[PDB]
Symmetry: D2
Subunit: 193 residues, 4 copies
């Protein structure tokens, strides 16, 4: 078990070191996008499945409540939290529209869709991006592996932060760190402390 | 048990009959308020605690997904669904602002806050209403008993639908029916045919 | 709008009157089943989609927290609340196993599955019942319309409470009342006040 | 922003390196505790607030659905997911027992309570641990800083995994990694091949 645990931490450390070198520019661009949207009075809609759903909620809470400093609640909403809405939509033929329906209903031009997916192929995530585009929203996608379908649906004004890894557990861990570095940048820019 | 069950249904029926006579006007006014907000491109924020939280989600899902008629998703969000955001806020001295923080962040002038409480005294609901007013939002309050503190915060443009009952179970049931008649009216007014 | 609202309340009142005459025996049996399971130290797993998910949570909260009197927390769990688990399972080919997986993992002989469905045809609900049977659990199904597939999967020791209605909104309202009369019976039998 | 992002990743990496040296033994002990409980037919109750709530759900979903290997659903439940139950409890004077009430109702001797808190002081977490001990449950606590009040409640059979850090963001990231290494061990021990 000891060896296994060490190998676990080592793979993580190696992934983070690889990421620290390759992701700074994308993370900075993503932060600029989020900050500008917020400054313009827009909101951030977030979505993800499974662990990615949890990472989306972590971003939402960091904005709505706080990350590390006392400042006003910032407008961010996770679209993977209302179990009534979710199980009701999935209780249909077009079950992959769970996120798309919410984006179409709530999204406004200037808003940002924070999409989180380890593999980037989930149909509900893809449809959410399609819906965001129909609402003139910008996309920030946290991905892994090869980016999947999601990476191929982003325009020049959108930002992909692809973790350099092909192991879901490591990618999800890196997504949490990514969200945290993003939150640190948002608050340092808008509410330094 | 037979008699008890019959007394249970009897109380419900008597309450519904009393409500049918006294609530149509208020329900109609609330429907007009909700319809007007939606037509103006605004959204409906909803909140409640416990069973009232469930009632809030039912309204949100009926808007976001659908009620009965086939039409586009309407913008409604329940503020009592993101467990990460909620437990994060209630993790400190600020438990009473679980809803207020979300209203501060998301509420825009013209939006509506659908507040649901059987007694109308819960501090977090009172504060959500207070915050909504600060954001130039109209309030539609579903209450019971004497309306509580919530009732005292409403202005000429807000609408209170106070179930004539002093038993939370009956009030909660009447709130679901109320929400359902409101959904029927919203859909009949916006998408008739 | 006034007339529409009145017709809404009238349909509800008529449904409740029809139910008060036809459901007492089934509700009593369901209550006996739930009480006996609890007395034997077992638990109640609950599941439903959409509004039914909300009704399931209402039962869970009434047991875990309280209904109307102060007594110990009773073991009831809604299987439609963990959004991470839900969106992760649905993020697969066997998406209809969202509830079944949880029942197989958590269910023990003697436990009860409280299944709520307006039409009784949802595949995830059907699979949850199949799983409960594999765990020697008893079933209490709150249904509507003709009972759908669900009604045809119940044995002699299981209990179906079929609302005499073919209108989802009315059925869901009646399910809440049914849960409340059930909770009143559970507490009157175990903790009278 | 570039430098800030790099300092962000650097702190994470340094923390992971420190943790790799000091936590293997504790993680191994925790894994053995979790595996033993599961083998005995027991379940794992999980709880946390905010981001720790998200981490708790990740562990629960990895057990209930799956982590990486194809095997049966394992019994784990996060106590911070039913928003109706949570808001119902926190609707009164009893907000600090949101988790304790669930543990009282559901906990059996032999079960394990996976408690997650960066500081280990939150009253609702302390009370959940207190209640778990009352139900003869073993405790696996994921903490940070100095372990807080939580650390002081642990006995010889419980396991504390205290991340060597004084920054909640880093601790939360390390908790996800910790949970992932634990899941890997559980699956390697129970379903190797």
């Amino acid at each position: 078990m000891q060896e296994r645990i060490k190998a676990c931490f080592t793979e993580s450390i190696q992934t983070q070191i690889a990421a620290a070198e390759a992701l700074p520019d994308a993370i900075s661009r993503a932060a600029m996008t989020l900050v500008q949207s917020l400054l313009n009075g827009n909101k951030i809609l977030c979505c993800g499945n499974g662990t990615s759903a949890a990472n989306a909620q972590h971003f939402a809470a960091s904005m709505i409540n706080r990350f590390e400093t006392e400042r006003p609640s910032l407008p961010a909403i996770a679209l993977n939290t209302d179990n009534v809405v979710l199980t009701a939509i999935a209780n249909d033929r077009l079950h992959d529209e769970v996120y798309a329906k919410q984006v179409r209903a709530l999204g406004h031009a200037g808003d940002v869709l924070l999409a989180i997916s380890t593999r980037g192929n989930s149909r509900d995530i893809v449809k959410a991006v399609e819906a965001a585009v129909t609402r003139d929203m910008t996309i920030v996608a946290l991905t892994g592996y090869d980016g999947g379908e999601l990476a191929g649906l982003l325009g020049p004004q959108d930002v992909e932060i692809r973790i350099p890894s092909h192991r879901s557990a490591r990618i999800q861990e890196m997504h949490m760190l990514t969200v945290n570095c993003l939150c640190d940048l948002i608050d340092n820019t808008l509410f330094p402390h």
